[PDB]
Amino acid sequence: MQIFVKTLTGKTITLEVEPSDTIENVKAKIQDKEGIPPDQQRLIFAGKQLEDGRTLSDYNIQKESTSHLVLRLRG
């Protein structure tokens, strides 16, 4: 499935993922496109920060017809 990530400029990128993928795995894909290491990424979905050891399904991100996440820089 596809997800959209609002980057630090207010623009977006797209990632291809699976619902059971871990948050850490998603951050690795964001690092590939944006050059921000996973330890400096904060991902927000539906107002909640996503935890590295959790999966996308833990947050029901796949239930939305369009999956919208927001990237913030730690610090």
Author numbering: 1 to 75
Show passages lifted from the paper:
The Ser/Thr protein kinase PINK1 phosphorylates the well‐folded, globular protein ubiquitin (Ub) at a relatively protected site, Ser65. We previously showed that Ser65 phosphorylation results in a conformational change in which Ub adopts a dynamic equilibrium between the known, common Ub conformation and a distinct, second conformation wherein the last β‐strand is retracted to extend the Ser65 loop and shorten the C‐terminal tail. We show using chemical exchange saturation transfer (CEST) nuclear magnetic resonance experiments that a similar, C‐terminally retracted (Ub‐CR) conformation also exists at low population in wild‐type Ub.
Therefore, we mutated Leu67 to Ser with the prediction that it would encourage β5‐strand slippage to place residue 67 in the Ser65 pocket, and fill the Leu67 hydrophobic pocket with Leu69 instead. Indeed, 1H‐15N BEST‐TROSY 2D spectra (bTROSY) of 15N‐labelled Ub L67S showed 73 peaks implying a single Ub conformation. The chemical shift pattern did not match wt Ub, but more closely resembled the pattern seen for the phosphoUb‐CR conformation. Hence, Ub L67S predominantly adopts the Ub‐CR conformation despite lacking phosphorylated Ser65. The structures highlight important consequences of the Ub‐CR conformation. The Ser65‐containing loop (aa 62–66) protrudes from and lacks defined contacts with the Ub core, is flexible judging by B‐factor analysis and in Ub L67S adopts distinct conformations in the two molecules in the asymmetric unit. Unlike the common Ub conformation, where this loop is predominantly in the “out” position and Leu8 contributes to the Ile44 patch, the β1–β2 loop is in the “in” position in Ub‐CR mutants such as Ub L67S; in this position, Leu8 contributes to the Ile36 patch. Phos‐tag gels and mass spectrometry (MS) showed that PhPINK1 phosphorylates Ub L67S at multiple sites, on Ser65, and on Thr66 or on the introduced Ser67. Consistently, in a large‐scale mutational study in Saccharomyces cerevisiae, the Ub L67S mutation was shown to have detrimental effects on yeast growth (Roscoe et al, 2013; Roscoe & Bolon, 2014).
